[PDB]
Amino acid sequence: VLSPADKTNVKAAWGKVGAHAGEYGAEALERMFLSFPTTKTYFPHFDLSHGSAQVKGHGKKVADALTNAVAHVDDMPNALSALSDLHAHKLRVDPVNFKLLSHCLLVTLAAHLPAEFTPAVHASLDKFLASVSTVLTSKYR
Amino acid sequence: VLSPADKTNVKAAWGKVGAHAGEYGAEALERMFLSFPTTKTYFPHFDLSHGSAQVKGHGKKVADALTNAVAHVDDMPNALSALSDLHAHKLRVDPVNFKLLSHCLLVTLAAHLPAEFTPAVHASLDKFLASVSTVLTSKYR
């Protein structure tokens, strides 16, 4: 459960991301594809080459959804209903994969927001991505 | 989330366990110790030998808790609060181990309730143990 401190930490951190969220989305995917190649099984229809527009585009999409989640940190389940649906009934990504993208996202934030990536903020973002993951896989069965 | 169907399934299968819960609890533990030896790191103080009374004693406690969650299937977070606190604050069992025990509990039930361990029931019991595990781990951070 996200504490008030957590919600604050997250909003701050994401606040600094700003106009780069799309690039960070794209970078996290790229890191995911390379470090955990089993994740590529869900994107057979994409050109997973470095700098592919499909990956860039998707990166934006993901980033945007996180934004919307930070904004509705208080009502995630509701803010992400559609996405929870899509994933549970259409995409059907195995749940283990969410932990992999979450990790690549932390790494990406860490590498780009040095001053802001304090131990307390690291803990908060992790919980946050975990909560997001829970929401996205809540209707799986 | 457990559906009405799930609830019926669980009360039914658990109903059949009856008085053998204790013994099935002990058996699930032993199966766990044998198949996932890493789980033994949490019981350095136990005699894990075959027919250990400590294991017998422990199997009963676990079985009683599961029986309590079935009795309060509509209020598990509250029915298990105490146990949730203990695990989060004292025991501090890594979350991955809940899935291991769950698995050995399912094997045990399967081995003992051939007629009831239908596909439908198997699925309900799996969602149930996952929910119990979630409650027990909810206060971890």
Add this chain to the structure above:
Amino acid sequence: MHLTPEEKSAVTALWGKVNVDEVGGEALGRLLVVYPWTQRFFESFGDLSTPDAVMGNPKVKAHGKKVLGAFSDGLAHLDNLKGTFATLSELHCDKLHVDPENFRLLGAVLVCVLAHHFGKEFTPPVQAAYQKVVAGVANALAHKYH
């Protein structure tokens, strides 16, 4: 694959009693029912809407038998699973695009199936041998992913 000789005899003795046709259908059907997300690979199999629709589907039964068939062959080459499963590993990756976690879910379901069928005969120590086996097979099937 740390199968002691005694673990290997135990795997083999029980496997002698299995009706692969039957176990194959049960394991695959149960997978589709317990972890419905796995149904993503079988939209051409037809109706998988309910447990009976899945369990009785002639296509699921036939596929289960195929899968367990390949698994049984694996059990005769416990020594060289990687070699045994190499072309299949490639196929699952490159053509089928099957996330390898699927191989671990199937292994857990299979263990429950063997427990279901053998009852008391599927002792703690026999389960432990089979746990090593399904893990070795899952690993072998994932070895060629890239």
Add this chain to the structure above:
Amino acid sequence: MHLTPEEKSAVTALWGKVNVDEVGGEALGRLLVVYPWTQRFFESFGDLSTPDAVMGNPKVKAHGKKVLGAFSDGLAHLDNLKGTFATLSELHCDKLHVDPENFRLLGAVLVCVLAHHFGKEFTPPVQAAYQKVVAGVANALAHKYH
């Protein structure tokens, strides 16, 4: 390891720029803060009630240096992590009772610390090689558990 000469060189080269003292203290402390349950093994260290108290705890910082030290030396036996961590594997099992999952948590934390420190330098391809090492290390350390 299943490290590519190119992958080996990337690991090796970034490592050369690492202050084990600082990275060790930071990795262990972050661990205790992000995954609070890992604190169960360090009760004798003191007050770990807050990020601040963990990050400042000298016992923490010094244990962190010992751990990265041992890790650091394992990077010199990248082709036999198993043999390098055998004794450490037994100790962790038999004396410390540390669940191997902790090895994996630290690894992930380690990678976040490297990214934190090296920014730009810690590229996708470089993270990929480090992911292989941390997994490798965790496996080596868990190898002698029974």
